[PDB]
Amino acid sequence: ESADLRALAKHLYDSYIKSFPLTKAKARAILTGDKSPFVIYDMNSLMMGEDKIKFSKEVAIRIFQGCQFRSVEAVQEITEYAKSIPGFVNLDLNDQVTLLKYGVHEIIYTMLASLMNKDGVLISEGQGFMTREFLKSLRKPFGDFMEPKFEFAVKFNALELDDSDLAIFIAVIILSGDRPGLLNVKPIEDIQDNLLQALELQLKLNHPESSQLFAKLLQKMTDLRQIVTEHVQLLQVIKKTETHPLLQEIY
Amino acid sequence: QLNPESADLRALAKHLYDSYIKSFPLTKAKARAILTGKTTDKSPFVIYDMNSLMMGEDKIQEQSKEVAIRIFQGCQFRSVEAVQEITEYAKSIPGFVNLDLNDQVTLLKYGVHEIIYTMLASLMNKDGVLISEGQGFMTREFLKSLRKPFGDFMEPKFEFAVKFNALELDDSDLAIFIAVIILSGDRPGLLNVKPIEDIQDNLLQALELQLKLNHPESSQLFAKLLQKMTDLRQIVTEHVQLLQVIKKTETDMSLHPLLQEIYKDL
């Protein structure tokens, strides 16, 4: 038993590395110490960032839209990772679609915590770092955008999880048999149970000193959903401003 | 091999179950007994409509107004007593009274409703809910048909209850779970979070051990229980966002102050 669990864990860790360009081991190195990224902290710090950073309206509207693009991009990565989760591509296609539809938002904020610290967040592959203070200073309602997520990251990162821990954790979120619309819950839940097992063992072997880390992590799914519904409400409010057709479509 | 560490956990579990029974009149076992027929002397008077409601009053505000509202006032008062019960239970939690007093308040302020709906599930089944200490049973349809802004206060509850009840938790599981809920460090305002987490940690140790010993054949029941914690939060939020409406549609309807303080700033 412990066998198959280790296997499943290494499997997910590796798939996680293949599907996600910027791991947490890297985001953390960057945030601390080596090719220092371009700190964006000022309006004029931003303009210089537009050029020094690379592979319409005001400015706050351009940053939020910038997050949109990254989101859609990330969604594909998450989708490719998901297919790696043993048993996933065997489920009914409608359910795979459903699980992804309701699971990506929770996964984006989970991984976003990987690129955040109490003072800011890494943007564009980690080339930059827009400070928390600056983001907060964006004219309403855009200065309530990242503040909530920052409070989440502080708490989530306090668990000190690593890529091998998150790899499994992300899978659990995807295999959530509670998504509205599912046609066949049995298989999904069965997989989640098995994933919950792998994550439990992964935590007691990796963080033997962390008492009940497993329990504290599960408790965070609450925070995630708070974040997600709150973010969805922001989108409603916003959906009232400067009102390409193909772009709006892509989102 | 019973270990001395797991010996304390077991002890912690017996302790909490005891205060749970001592603090709450209507346990799940009794509620269960009443609902499933281990009755002849325990059967409730069922309310599934207006005349039935009229007739139920006898054995089961300070005057009268409207149904939907008389029922609402009903629940309001009932929860004032539950808060009192939970507060009584809280104090029994090893370490809860030692905490800062401000945090004591914080914990209860947010914890009271997650626990009420957790326990309210014990008195429900897909078809309705027990009331008046179990002497009565109000059907899901009667409630869901109440006047516009009210015929929607309960539906989400049943929704969660049939799902939650599916885990098949019994009173000795719930006492520990309820303690976990109260001792949650991630509550707004908490001055001292560390002490609150060392306690909750222990409780979770108790619960994980309790569930494995009590439901050996139920795979990952622990984790499945914890996930439910998010359903409660939404139940609460969804709820709060319903009082506000009552607070606008029904201006002549008062609210017990206590409840007005718990809901305040949430």
Residue numbers in the entry:
A (entry chain B): 207 to 239, 243 to 264, 274 to 461, 466 to 473
B (entry chain A): 203 to 262, 271 to 476
Question: What does the report in the manuscript say about this coordinate set?
Answer:
Peroxisome proliferator-activated receptors (PPARs) belong to the nuclear hormone receptor family, which is defined as transcriptional factors that are activated by the binding of ligands to their ligand-binding domains (LBDs).
The two LBD–ligand complex structures revealed how the pan agonist is adapted to the similar, but significantly different, ligand-binding pockets of the PPARs. On the other hand, the two protomers in the asymmetric unit of the PPARγ LBD–TIPP-703 complex exhibited slightly different conformations at the C-terminus, leading to the loss of several protein–ligand contacts. The overall binding modes of the pan agonist are similar between the two PPARs, but significant differences are observed in the protein–ligand interaction. In contrast, in the PPARγ LBD complex the same group mainly interacts with Arg280 and Ile281 on the H3 helix.
